């Protein structure tokens, strides 16, 4: 379980870091 | 521990037996004659396993892992024309040497030694094509001199070419020989190599074959094609435990572990109930037998495929495989009835072995009378009794040295003295085999290790 878990976790970490570096499309307004 | 097995067709009888066996396997696994599997490649779920015996070149074509080798191109061309695309044309060996110049074992040995590189290259190509392998199955057909010589050459090559593989052989013995001298000479020269290098050997005496083909078939005349059909059905039944893998016996090595007590005792006796996949198989639903009656018929001398000559026969390893819907209570009843009726040696407490296989989901289902069939293989010393006729012919003809002008050519020895010495050595080898068998028939065989430690 740890193998696929750490694989998916590394993939998700890379994806989140890239999405945060790319202008951060997530926003909140008022 | 299960590996792939490559079929070796040698001689005319061997090629006919191989063709019949491959047609039977095609009918069982729904492969047909055209080579292309009759079942669509979409239904991938298959309870059987053709991979050990068939090469999966494509998803819909199962090419049999078999090599045919013969000196007469007529039978090879006939088989190739009948089975269009089924066999591999690159696995057909003829050497373009023409017809066999006699029925001498020396001629076959010479025609095998001269073209040994071609057959070895074909075997190497098949080994490169396959990924897994366990051993070969050689069809000797010792009745023919050239076929027996080719089989002996194949054995003498494979023994020291692939020692990590177990070698099984199938030697077909004739009922009444036209030229008893030459046929006994060929059988003895093949038996020498069988004792030397072969790991397992199954004998097929033609007398019981003719008897069964006259009894169960309606036509009084017996034809060699449906005679070899019986041997091919026997081979398919004994390879069923690997083709449709059972739960207890799933490898030829595991089967021969319980079928072979020692490398010296490597000769079995087969028996089978009235067949159901042969030509005239309509007279089987009138018997109405159970598994107990199937075991009784298997142990009966009328269903054995070799000359029984049962005069208080000593059994060493009795094994049976029952295919169909078998009942465990009936199996236990048959075992209890047979353990009180089969002679067992007092030095070994090992009893007979029973295995239950599965029926093919595509084979024609038989009525409840003969829906279940059985095969039995017994280690009996009566094989030396079958050989005794050839040994007596040798002892009564070797006094003069007749037919010596035929075994002198081809082989590595052209003089008469060398051929006489080789024949005497082969006779001594078969005599020592018979002595070992008649000694293992006694209790002192196991006491030999008890008296000295």
């Amino acid at each position: 379980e740890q193998e696929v878990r750490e694989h998916q976790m590394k993939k998700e970490r890379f994806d989140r870091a890239l999405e945060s570096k790319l202008l951060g499309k997530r926003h909140i307004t008022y | 521990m299960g590996g792939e097995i490559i079929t070796l067709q040698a001689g005319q009888c061997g090629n006919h037996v191989g063709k019949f066996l491959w047609s039977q396997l095609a009918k069982e696994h729904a492969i047909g004659t055209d080579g292309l599997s009759q079942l669509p490649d979409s239904s991938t779920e298959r309870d059987d396993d053709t991979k050990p015996f068939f090469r999966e070149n494509s998803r819909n074509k199962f090419t049999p892992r078999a090599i045919m080798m013969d000196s007469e191109p007529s039978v090879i061309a006939d088989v190739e024309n009948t089975f269009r695309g089924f066999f591999d044309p690159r696995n057909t060996w003829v050497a373009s040497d023409g017809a066999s110049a006699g029925n001498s074992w020396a001629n076959g040995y010479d025609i095998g030694t001269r073209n040994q590189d071609d057959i070895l290259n074909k075997i190497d190509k098949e080994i490169d094509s396959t990924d897994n392998f366990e051993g070969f199955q050689l069809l000797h057909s010792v009745a023919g001199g050239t076929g027996s010589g080719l089989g002996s050459n194949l054995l003498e090559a494979l023994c020291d070419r692939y020692p990590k593989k177990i070698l099984t052989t199938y030697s077909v013995f004739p009922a009444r020989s036209s030229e008893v001298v030459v046929q006994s000479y060929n059988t003895i020269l093949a038996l020498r190599r069988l004792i030397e290098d072969s790991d397992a050997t199954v004998v097929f005496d033609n007398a019981s074959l003719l008897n069964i083909s006259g009894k169960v078939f309606r036509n009084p005349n017996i034809d060699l094609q449906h005679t070899n059909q019986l041997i091919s059905t026997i081979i398919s039944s004994v390879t069923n435990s690997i083709r449709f893998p059972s739960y207890m016996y799933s490898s030829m090595s595991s089967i021969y572990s319980t079928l072979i007590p020692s490398p010296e005792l490597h000769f079995l006796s087969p028996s089978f109930t009235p067949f159901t996949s042969d030509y005239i198989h309509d007279d089987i639903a009138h018997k109405g037998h159970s598994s107990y009656d199937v075991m009784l018929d298997l142990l009966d001398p009328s269903n054995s495929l070799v000359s029984t000559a049962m005069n208080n026969p000593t059994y060493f390893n009795v094994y049976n495989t029952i295919i169909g819907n078998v009942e465990p209570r009936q199996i236990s009843r048959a075992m209890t009835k047979l353990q009180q009726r089969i002679k067992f040696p007092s030095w070994s407490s090992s009893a007979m072995h029973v295995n239950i296989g599965r029926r093919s989901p595509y084979l024609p289902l038989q009525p409840n009378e003969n829906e279940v069939s059985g095969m039995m293989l017994s280690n009996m010393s009566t094989v030396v009794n079958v050989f005794e006729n050839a040994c007596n012919t040798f002892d009564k003809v070797f006094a003069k040295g007749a037919f010596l002008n035929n075994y002198n050519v081809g082989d590595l020895f052209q003089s008469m003295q060398n051929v006489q010495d080789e024949f005497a050595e082969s006779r001594e080898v078969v005599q020592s085999l018979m002595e070992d068998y008649v000694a293992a028939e006694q209790d002192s065989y196991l006491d030999d290790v008890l008296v000295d430690d």
Partner: protein, 85 residues
């Protein structure tokens, strides 16, 4: 253990279960098998250190019983006996 799971996948490919691997639904059924090894023994043999850990997924877990960490390990002991034999 990456070479171990690669050998497991190669054995699945080589065995008769290659038909189930070709079939897409049975392919997912086979992929549901967890190639998880529970180490048993200190420096023991590769046979004794081997262990099979299987994880179910709904809605099959609500019906089928497996070697749950809070169960009786019936399948575990049966597989261990058969593995010794």
């Amino acid at each position: 253990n990456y070479k171990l799971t690669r050998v497991l996948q190669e054995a699945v490919q080589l065995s008769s279960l290659r038909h189930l691997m070709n079939s897409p639904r049975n392919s997912s059924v086979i992929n549901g098998l967890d190639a998880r090894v529970l180490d048993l023994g200190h420096g023991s043999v590769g046979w004794d250190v081997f262990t099979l850990d299987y994880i179910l997924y709904p809605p099959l877990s609500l019906v089928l019983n497996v070697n749950r960490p809070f169960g009786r390990k019936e399948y575990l002991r049966i597989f261990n006996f058969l593995w010794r034999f």
